[PDB]
Amino acid sequence: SLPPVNTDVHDWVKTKGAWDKGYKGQGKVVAVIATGIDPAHQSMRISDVSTAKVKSKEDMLARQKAAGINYGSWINDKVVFAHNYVENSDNIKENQDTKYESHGMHVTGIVAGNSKEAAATGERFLGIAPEAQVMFMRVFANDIMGSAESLFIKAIEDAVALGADVINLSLGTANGAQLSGSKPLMEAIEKAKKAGVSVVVAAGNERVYGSDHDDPLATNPDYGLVGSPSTGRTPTSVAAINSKWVIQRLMTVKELENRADLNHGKAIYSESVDFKDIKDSLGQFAYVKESTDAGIALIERDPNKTYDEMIALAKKHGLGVLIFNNKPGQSNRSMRFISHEFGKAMSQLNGNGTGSLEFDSVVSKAPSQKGNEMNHFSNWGLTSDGYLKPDITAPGGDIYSTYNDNHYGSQTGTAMASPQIAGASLLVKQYLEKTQPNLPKEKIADIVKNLLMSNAQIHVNPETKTTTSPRQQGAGLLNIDGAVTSGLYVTGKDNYGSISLGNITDTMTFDVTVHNLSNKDKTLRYDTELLTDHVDPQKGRFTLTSHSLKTYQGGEVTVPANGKVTVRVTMDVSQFTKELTKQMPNGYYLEGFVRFRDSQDDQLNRVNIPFVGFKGQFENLAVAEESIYRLKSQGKTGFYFDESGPKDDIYVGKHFTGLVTLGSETNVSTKTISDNGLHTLGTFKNADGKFILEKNAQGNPVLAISPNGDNNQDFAAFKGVFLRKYQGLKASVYHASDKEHKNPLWVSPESFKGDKNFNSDIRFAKSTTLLGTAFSGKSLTGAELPDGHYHYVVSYYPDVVGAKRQEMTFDMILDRQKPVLSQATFDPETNRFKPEPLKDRGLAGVRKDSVFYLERKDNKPYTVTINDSYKYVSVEDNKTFVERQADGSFILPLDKAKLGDFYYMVEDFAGNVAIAKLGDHLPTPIKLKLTDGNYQTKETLKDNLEMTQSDTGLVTNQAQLAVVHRNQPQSQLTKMNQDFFISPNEDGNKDFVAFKNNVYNDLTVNVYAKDDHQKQTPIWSSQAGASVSAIESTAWYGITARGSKVMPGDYQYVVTEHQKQYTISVNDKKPMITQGRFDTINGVDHFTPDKTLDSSGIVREEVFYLAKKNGRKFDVTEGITVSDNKVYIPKNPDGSYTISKRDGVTLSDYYYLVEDRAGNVSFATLRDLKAVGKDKAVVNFGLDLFTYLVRDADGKPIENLEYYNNSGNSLILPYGKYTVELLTYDTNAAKLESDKIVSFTLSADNNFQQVTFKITMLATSQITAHFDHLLPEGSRVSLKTAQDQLIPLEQSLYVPKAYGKTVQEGTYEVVVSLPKGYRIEGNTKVNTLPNEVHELSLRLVKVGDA
Ligand SMILES: [Ca+2]
Ligand SMILES: [Ca+2]
Ligand SMILES: [Ca+2]
What we know:
Rossmann fold; serine-type endopeptidase activity; Glucose Oxidase, domain 1; virion; peptidoglycan-anchor; calcium; binds calcium ion; mainly beta; monomer; globular; 1346 residues; cell wall; seven-stranded parallel β-sheet; 15 helices
């Protein structure tokens, strides 16, 4: 009578086994944290509310009051609680086939669907736990805060507090660590486990390292991408397998209805990125078979001719393009007029004649072409710190579940596999509460997981016929019946359902424990299967399939009733070492399963445990791919490097480990107003515009910089292809002579951490540039390091405790000296210009010499290029080069230009350019003197000041900041006799403080913080040779000696029997523009801005409109300067500005500009300020060094939010008393210092309120205690906090002598308690630094009583 239950998944995962025992999920609650839900769906129902946890709306209201939750609502007997956490509302339904799509709804159907009504297959669809209640937390990623981790934490805490049994979380970041995830998220998950809550999370959908590019290289075995928080020990990580059955629109051939091997005449068909089958049919067609692709079309796929040329041929001959595969048994290809592909076997019988064809509109069941195969995108292990994740597998590919408005659809992902496990966890919890009632809250989540893992069914790849890797499937495929029928689970030393062995040498030895929850003894027979990765011998890449090595018999073991037994598994793996070390030279995985079964019958008591070890040193595998310079000299190739283009082309957008720098062209006719962007260090532009890694006379490349301020090769920064997650990355400089790298001359002020360049899709980068590692040729004290041979060293660590520090050394030259131009000969007979043989002044060496003249185009020797897309202006010399002859001479074309109009240019490998204009020394070869015309030089700031007695002597820069154009505006020097405030942002306006009929000697400029009254320690000081003539030597740009920007605040700038002290405030906070007022007098509009110490004071106001010219809001004029098309409006005597109508100017074209005392500029559209009514007020909320709720005078939250000047943190409100409550903020990166609740009153007198939440920023560090020898049995290592708390440290998995943790920045002490007879020698104290790794080397010293 009632429709049949679809069992496509249920027969596979064995759900009936628990359902028959009475475990359907009644009395349980599942919290689904997802995108959206339709709580009205026919599936969202329970059979009996008498046995349910939340019996009514009143029961939930009581739960809310007791939990302190004054939001969210009960919806029905199934959806007992819902809230939208992003928007803070009860708008829980999404997307209000694509029309009804809802990820969250799909997910909810899988765990707890309970439809009474039949879907399109004629079957009703049920979830794993159909009688369970649902809690729905609507949380998702948004532009304002991408992670939304803080909202997911609050949702987790709510679910636990309101009474959930299981939580299904889709949140995730690839390559998760087990022991170093975010502190508030890991704490929230740990409080859930303590409450008896199972936390179920998808593994992710990124496959392995390089999945969007190619298979990983056999030399790079750390390719795991399993995501965080699933990589946490507490959550259950879920991998996905493809369903054996698919429900979709198929293709029917009624004559082939008698073929049960061909799904009774129904076929699966595929299309490319563009779908055009709608234009062909909806819901009969005669087809015709073709044998040749030469002169509906039924055709066999051709390996020679493309899909395009097969389709085109069918159009020319006459209906449709039904392409059938040439490979038997193969799934349909992605093909990338109407066309579609389908199976070979299906068309071997379609091919036999001519007849019927019909594309069905309604979905139908079909066996999957890729069924019982691990999903291609399912995330593999290991964990970034080397633990075995994921934990288990469940069907996630082609899952048919609930969509909006009683609809249904198919979706693929670990996100569909996750609710299978969430549902199963509800049934196992219900089973343990009945059968093990004394098992406490705090222990139940670990046992639910252990039963599901041990009773899981081990997958065998149906193609290779080999056991799927534990790193891909985990413990195996979900078996619900086994987890509720057997009373058995398997554990290792750690008390977990899987074993992570650490490093392997010649032997694998581990202890396996079987637990019996039943009243009778069980005799099990066991064997262990050993596997490794299969490598393609032709490509030297991992195939991501396994190789079975050996099966070891273990014999029989008896597991006592209500008890446990422990066995030892020993395996000598040395016999395989030679063969496998050849294939995988940097080490390889040794993994598999210990399989237990009943000694009497094969079918009963099938329980198992996955294990994984690494043969080698997992902790010391390369973090960064070898440099492009080193790869090129060995003839090797990088994983992501594009080898196309000319020989040795290293275009900077390519993906490699190397050094980058900024280029700036040298012009001869005008000044350079723009740089050329970044380029690869050691590469130079050829005649075709391509950057080539050029060689010196010795055939080696040269890495050299010229830090002289001309913006051409001034610095060198690290760029890397990261193979593994890294931490504590920094750059350091040494003398080339300092081979041991003992005396650092300069260290990057900051340290870095980040992800491996996994490149799962186009959004994930294949390489990372770290501009923070830039070396500009200055020491730690900011002194100029002299020209010479240095070593630029990039050091970093893997995310594995005990790993050795890794480093990449680059030989680098500092050379600030232009090459030598002296003499040349010129032969009037042949026009031969012969310069003196090439010589460089410095160590870099001359790379190229050239000759050019200036081509006059449009009566100018230069070209002004206007890039409207970036609103940028470029100016370039029209350089026309003369060919260099084999003997190094040049034949000057005198018809093109006169002898005196030729330039001779010499450039070194460091970026130093010498240019001589032939003709500066002009009135058979005639001798000709050459000198550089100083064309390449550091720009100099306009100094047209005269210092009078009244002046303080303090100088600064001034520049008009742009609204439209992106060119660096003209800046000039100005006096600072008032408003001693600076904005160190290098925009040309008040960026620094400097000192200018007198004479000064021993000039000494020093800067000290506010409280340094005794002048004890300067933060910055001037460099040896400071003069009143050169303002650069005394200019302080709001930085430390190490080059870091000083924090906002006041400072002592003191010039030195004379000592001139001056207090300078630093602030780059943009001014906050208020709405002002608008009035219409005699038809003409009027704008009256609001009248305004602390650097927020306004020094100048502007009102203007941007007059559009030549399709742009900016103009370029020949001095060459770039300007905005600003038409100014004068201030009226009362204080207003007349916004008089102009023939083509609107209010959105008008602006109000303000400059503060610090030189920070803000501007706003007049139409934006006008959006606030004459009666309304504005409030702004911010953090100073998130989600908020505003309530009216009554206490009712505000509705119909009105946003001011395009800010989601600025609200337009009527007058009245209000309250603001800070609800969430990232507790991981920030700490709140002020009140969460703020009262503010908006009125006519106070029509603009600023409300700030004072926050302190948080940083992390890594501490590792590394010992001499292994610590004796009984030793405890912990870290002592400044607040007297002890953090227990555990022996690292890969480095047993090391103990470490990722901690918040602060002071710590390594505490060690040893048995009698030992002492620890060495420092235990550490003052940790941001993103830094602190290694503590300690000695275990034997001791005796005196
Ligand atoms: Ca330079
Ligand atoms: Ca040089
Ligand atoms: Ca500035």
